[PDB]
Design a protein around this ligand. Structure first.
Ligand SMILES: C[C@@H](CCO)[C@@H]1NC(=O)[C@H](C[C@@](C)(O)CO)NC1=O
Ligand SMILES: O=C(O)CCC(=O)C(=O)O
Ligand SMILES: [Fe+2]
Length: 317
């Protein structure tokens, strides 16, 4: 089901759509307060889950200031205190090729770290931020699973442990180098179940249906994305949920962001796998969790195979 360079062939037309973006997306808005996850009404929640993206009000108790500073500093090198030294931590420090500082082939450079290292490696205030976002993400995920009609007995296996905060969690910081040419971050779907994105400036674009649209800047809200694992899991339920195709436009001045990603456990020696739920037969394994992550990473930055799909390029008409 997961073939290298072919994950996105069914949305290839979205990946090569480079028409100017003049629309802004009207996303549904939810809150997670004293009543759980709360949209304006049931219709709004259904629209949000079918689009695979919505806005989530940042709880008043949650402190993001250290994350915002880390996102603006991690890449600067050991000269710059307190966070510039994270530039120098590469994957061999963690025994995990996914983690540490990464200079991508798009404008973005990243620092990515999985939860098993937060307490040891991140500044304590950043580890605290990661744990708070994990508990917040956990509550969102359980609301979504409850609406999908999957029996609760199956949630732990269906979520690779995320239904009980036993999945894999990455707290990832993004810096868009405006001196680099071309797209800020290529169009993609995230690997996992739930992504919680903290953005404070223009750049994020989503393609919920047939057109790319700008996500409005609202620093009092998170953007919540569903990822490929959520799409795969619910693909045969009564109401399949979409993973949102999204990208970051070319940045003319530097931009920073960070995100919390929930995935099926993908430890190098303990991989919980990716499943789809069949209303008849139950859970069926589709692929490995790390397998999905690395084939996704390949195709996000190296591109989707386009043979036979050339009519989707505007210049061929
Ligand atoms: C699991 C981990 C990705 C590990 O490679 C998690 N999952 C994602 O899909 C994104 C994807 C891209 C845009 O960020 C990375 O370049 N980032 C994450 O941190
Ligand atoms: O920087 C952003 O707004 C988007 C980040 C993102 O989509 C990702 O890292 O997966
Ligand atoms: Fe993403």
């Amino acid at each position: 089901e997961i073939r290298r360079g072919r994950i996105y062939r069914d949305v290839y037309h979205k990946r090569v759509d480079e028409e100017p973006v003049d629309r802004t997306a009207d996303l549904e808005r939810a809150r997670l307060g004293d009543d759980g996850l709360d949209f304006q009404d049931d219709a709004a929640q259904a629209r949000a889950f079918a689009q695979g993206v919505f806005l989530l009000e940042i709880p008043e108790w949650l402190d993001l200031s250290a994350g915002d500073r880390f996102a603006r500093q991690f890449f600067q090198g050991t000269g710059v205190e307190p966070y510039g030294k994270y530039r120098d931590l590469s994957s061999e420090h963690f025994g995990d090729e996914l983690l540490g500082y990464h200079s991508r082939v798009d404008q973005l450079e990243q620092f990515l770290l999985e939860r098993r290292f937060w307490g040891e490696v991140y500044p304590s205030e950043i580890a605290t931020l990661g744990e708070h976002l994990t508990l917040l993400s956990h509550r969102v995920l359980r609301s979504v699973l409850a609406s999908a009609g999957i029996p609760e007995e199956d949630w732990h296996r269906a979520s690779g442990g995320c239904s009980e905060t036993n999945g894999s969690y990455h707290l990832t910081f993004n810096h868009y180098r405006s001196a680099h040419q071309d797209i800020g971050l290529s169009s993609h779907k995230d690997d996992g179940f739930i992504t919680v994105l903290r953005t404070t400036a223009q750049g994020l674009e989503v393609n919920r249906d047939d057109v790319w649209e700008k996500v409005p800047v609202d620093p009092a809200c998170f953007v919540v994305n569903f990822g490929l694992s959520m799409e795969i899991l619910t693909s045969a339920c009564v109401t399949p949920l979409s993973a949102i195709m999204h990208r970051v436009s070319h940045q003319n001045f530097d931009r920073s962001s960070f995100g919390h990603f929930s995935s099926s456990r993908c430890l190098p020696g303990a991989d919980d796998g990716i499943y789809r739920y069949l209303p008849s037969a139950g859970l069926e394994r589709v692929c490995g969790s790390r397998e999905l992550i690395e084939e996704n990473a390949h195709e996000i930055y190296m591109g989707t195979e386009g043979q036979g799909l050339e009519h989707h390029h505007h210049h061929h008409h």
